[PDB]
Every structure is written in C-alpha cells, then in structure tokens.
Amino acid sequence: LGSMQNQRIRIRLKAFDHRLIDQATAEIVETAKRTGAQVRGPIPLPTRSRTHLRLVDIVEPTEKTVDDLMRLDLAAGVDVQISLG
C-alpha cells in the first residue's frame, strides 16, 4: 500500500496463449491509465518453450490504481507475479 519507498508496481505475466497475454497486458495498462498512473513498457521477452512472457511496470500509482489492480480478474491460463515498493 501507498507508503512504500519506491512508488513502483512491477508486473510479470506468463501464458501459453499470446491472445490471452496481450489482452491481460492491455487491461493492466488500461487500469494504470484510468486511475492517474503511468506505465513503463510493457515489453515482450524472448519466448522460451510454449511460454510467452510480458513485463510491465506502473509508476506514479494512486490508491485507486492499487485497489483496481487488486480487483482485476485476469483470464484463466494467464499467470502473474506482482511486486509493490
């Protein structure tokens, strides 16, 4: 929450379906931009196996950004890692 020294949300996405991963990425980016935040990346990583990888960072997040991200339900078959602060 809020009072964290580095105001940055780092997100890593994994999926076998690129249509699912691009959609999830689009939704996170939209959530950031809706709520007064900014986005760094997203960038695609070199694919390894059947797995697509996406990295996206949210900078300058508001409380609404954080709450909306945590209320966001991504599509089945898309895996996430989220680090805050």
Binding site: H18, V29, V39, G41, I43, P44, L45, T47, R50, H52
Partner: protein
C-alpha cells in the same frame, strides 16, 4: 550486417510493442527504453529511426499489409504486428536495408518473440507484400 542493427530490430520489436499497448509519446518510449533496458551493443540511431519510422507511419504500413491479412482472422498478434510493421518499414523507406535481410530478420524476430509458428505467417505475408513494394526484389 552489424549485430548492432539486428539488436536494434530486437529492441524495436519490444519498444514498438510498448507503444502499441501504452500509446505513450514515442519520444518518451525511446528514452525510457534507453534508460531501463540493457542497450550497450545496439545501433541506437537505427533503433530511433525504426521507432519513429513505424510510429508515425502506422496507417501507411498497415495498408501495405492489409491485402494479405483480410481472411486469416485471429485479430493479428501484437508482436507479429510490430515485426511486420518493421519489415514493411524497411522495405518501403530503407534502401540501406537489402530485400532478403528485411524478410529474414522479420522471420527471426518472429521466431524469438512470436507465437509457435509465427515465423511462417510473417513469411507468408512478406513474400506476398515485398515483391509489390520492391519489384526489383533487391
């Protein structure tokens, strides 16, 4: 060609993907990438030229592409779209980049960042599109 030029294409695939999703100013996108990604071995001039090249020419570059897409329906992957826009940009606007190089680099870029058989679709579009843009095929 230099490995730095290939690296520029690789970095541009990633940055153009950034821009496609974020729609941030391409100048900001260039800067952010140069500040946050390892770019020590990259033709940084060509990276810039690819970015602005594509970002200010999306309508023109999609139009050269469209006649070979109109039927195979899964929207078109964001990575594939960026790879194809880069290739078409090089074919239309970059005489310093040879015919087979633009297509071959596109095919490898699709191998790396693309889906399963992305390289084969990218290939399908290009050698339909490329002769129309370069009748000399040089």
């Amino acid at each position: 060609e230099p490995a730095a030029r290939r690296r520029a294409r690789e970095c541009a695939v990633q940055a153009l993907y950034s821009w496609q999703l974020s729609q941030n100013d391409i100048a900001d996108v260039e800067y952010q990438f140069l500040a946050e990604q390892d770019v020590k071995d990259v033709d940084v001039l060509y990276f810039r030229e690819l970015l602005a090249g594509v970002a200010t020419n999306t309508a023109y570059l999609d139009g050269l592409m469209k006649p070979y897409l109109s039927r195979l329906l899964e929207e078109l992957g964001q990575v594939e779209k960026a790879v194809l826009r880069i290739a078409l940009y090089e074919l239309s606007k970059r005489s310093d980049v040879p015919y087979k190089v633009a297509i071959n680099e596109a095919i490898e870029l699709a191998k790396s960042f693309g889906a399963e058989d992305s390289h084969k679709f990218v290939n399908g579009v290009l050698d339909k599109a490329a002769p129309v843009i370069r009748p000399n095929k040089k």
